[PDB]
Amino acid sequence: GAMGSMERASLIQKAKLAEQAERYEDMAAFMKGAVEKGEELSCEERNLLSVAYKNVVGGQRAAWRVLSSIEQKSNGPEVREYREKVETELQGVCDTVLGLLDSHLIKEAGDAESRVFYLKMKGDYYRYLAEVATDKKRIIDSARSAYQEAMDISKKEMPPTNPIRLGLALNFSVFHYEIANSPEEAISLAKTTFDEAMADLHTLSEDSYKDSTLIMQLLRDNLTLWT
């Protein structure tokens, strides 16, 4: 790509600068270029990749929902055309991230912390595709499959307070609630995840305790809205 001539270390340094400048499209392009160097990513670098694309796709999702809402109220071609333009761009960003995971981040990820991180991402980006899908069943099953593999590994290999495990369960619970139309599964998962984390907090340092309880508060926030 356009980043082929830049050093890996320079792409990572510029991803960090772009984050400070709130230049998330640049941050994502620099991190795509770092991934395409073909070396595995460190924990910090995986987090830069995820923050970059989460910010980009989050702008697109927010724009898509505004346009879809206008379109639904309206029922000329312009609202549909413009919602389709934003949808196509969102789908492209999802396919780009899914392409990086499949070529070749997941297959080289052997540690639980990396493997679960990337499989969680794969579920998340299929979930974003599912949000705009009307193909839809197969997209939902792809999200479910990725989340389930990440959950199976996380349960075997990580303590229940592990923030990656917690963030996975959070996102899988929202998948259940509003993509799979399984609100009871969503509530059961969020409750079991919170309760098993609560019981392991005694094992943590002050800093690990802060990281785990921040995500546990997100599970509680959802449970409050769902019950």
């Binding site: 998330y24 995820s50 923050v51 989460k54 910010n55 980009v56 796709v57 989050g58 702008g59 999702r61 927010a62 929902r65 809402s69 969680k120 998340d124 963030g167 996975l168 959070l170 996102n171 929202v174 609630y177 509003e178 995500i215 997100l218 599970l219 926030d221 959802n222 809205l225 769902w226």
Partner: peptide, 12 residues
């Protein structure tokens, strides 16, 4: 749409 809490930047 009411969006539920998901992991990481609340960028939407």
């Amino acid at each position: 749409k009411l969006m539920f809490k998901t992991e990481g930047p609340d960028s939407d």
